[PDB]
Ligand binder design. Sequence first.
Ligand SMILES: Oc1c(C[NH+]2CCOCC2)ccc2ccccc12
Ligand SMILES: *[C@@H]1O[C@H](CO)[C@@H](O)[C@H](O)[C@H]1NC(C)=O
Length: 339
Amino acid sequence: DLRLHLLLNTSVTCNDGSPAGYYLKESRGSRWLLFLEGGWYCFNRENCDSRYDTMRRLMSSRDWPRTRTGTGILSSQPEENPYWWNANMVFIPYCSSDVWSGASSKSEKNEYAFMGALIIQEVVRELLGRGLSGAKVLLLAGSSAGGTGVLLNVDRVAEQLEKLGYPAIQVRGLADSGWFLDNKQYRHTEAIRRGIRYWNGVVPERCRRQFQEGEEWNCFFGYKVYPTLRSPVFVVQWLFDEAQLTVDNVHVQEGLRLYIQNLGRELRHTLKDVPASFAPACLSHEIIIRSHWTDVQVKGTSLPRALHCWDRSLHPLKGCPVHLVDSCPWPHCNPSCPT
Ligand SMILES: Oc1c(C[NH+]2CCOCC2)ccc2ccccc12
Ligand SMILES: *[C@@H]1O[C@H](CO)[C@@H](O)[C@H](O)[C@H]1NC(C)=O
């Protein structure tokens, strides 16, 4: 169980103005995993109002429970988490509906607050007083919108710790199911463009400088923002991601067969030069906090093993690979895919 702490700076809020927060389980014998929850987003007054009605835990802390059970990479049991079972564990709930990009308070012109980028900054600052000041490695991880959130925020956390005087903490990222293609749909980007303006969204500075004003939406797509990042980032992405297919209007004859095979090939291509990555040929979505995340393998290597090999590479390795991408071209051509 991880224990809830609401932020002491009550000006850093969820969408409805309630305080944001984090769930923490300390491990005093260890020198930190900070996980960003996902859950889509909203981009105007009308669809944010709908989300407040039936997805309110993603917009408010008013009904959060006092504890959460750590699962998958957040579990403290070696049988469930061979990778980092002894680490300090943090779960940051997603209550800003902005893909963790926003920096805008609720005001007399704004019905909702969109503060995802500032929530991450404030969690880091308050954790430094609870033990993070002594850390050797801070791994910023996340699933779905939280995985895109890692890509948008990992270099800002690194800069924050450097400016605060902690140059010895190594900041790294782990992006799960947050690597999308802005491709042609099977049946018939504007929502991101509108969302960024609604949220006052912020993107990493080197990427912003490349694409310039009005084109910041580009930095939400992994294959465009990743080359601009300085922190080490491990990318986990199913080749046939269910959220990607939903946006593509896919739910089998020749036209759809070719569409699906082309999607897998394009995703494989975007990862060819990503040295730390794990990309199985499965139809699924998210994995790192699922309890059975230890089951899937690529070329004989599990995801917990690949992450352990990544740790060793940051001190190629014999029998300990870090770049693992399936080549077979159809969902479940990998026998270890989730049923
Ligand atoms: O915008 C898209 C997404 C989701 N976006 C959400 C926010 O961050 C980045 C990805 C997924 C598939 C898409 C396919 C084609 C065009 C746009 C797409
Ligand atoms: C609380 O957070 C806001 C927004 O980031 C910031 O402007 C303010 O300085 C913070 N308060 C303190 C005491 O640091």
